[PDB]
Amino acid sequence: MTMNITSKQMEITPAIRQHVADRLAKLEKWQTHLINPHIILSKEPQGFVADATINTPNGVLVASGKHEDMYTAINELINKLERQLNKLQHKGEARRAATSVKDANFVEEVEEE
């Protein structure tokens, strides 16, 4: 977690910086790894543009949170990211029961359908 914050025209204010910082801090222990967390917080006419692009070992967790309230953008941002994170982490549901139980979580990608 290098914590990369690069905004467009709307620099990082003391209030906002502390906001995202606290969020990224706790989120640093999420079931991911967050290596290259690119947090881009810009100000748009019709709402704030919270573009948080995190580089996860599985891909990239892009947290998009648009809202007139800067603090609302930070919150809503971590919300969408969390949900998207849980999904990417979802990997617990093997065909149990029957005689096909004696098989650990081996190959679950590209089965049939």
Half-sphere exposure of 29 (CA within 13 A, CB side): 3
> Which domains does the chain show, CATH number per domain?
1-91 (3.30.160.100)
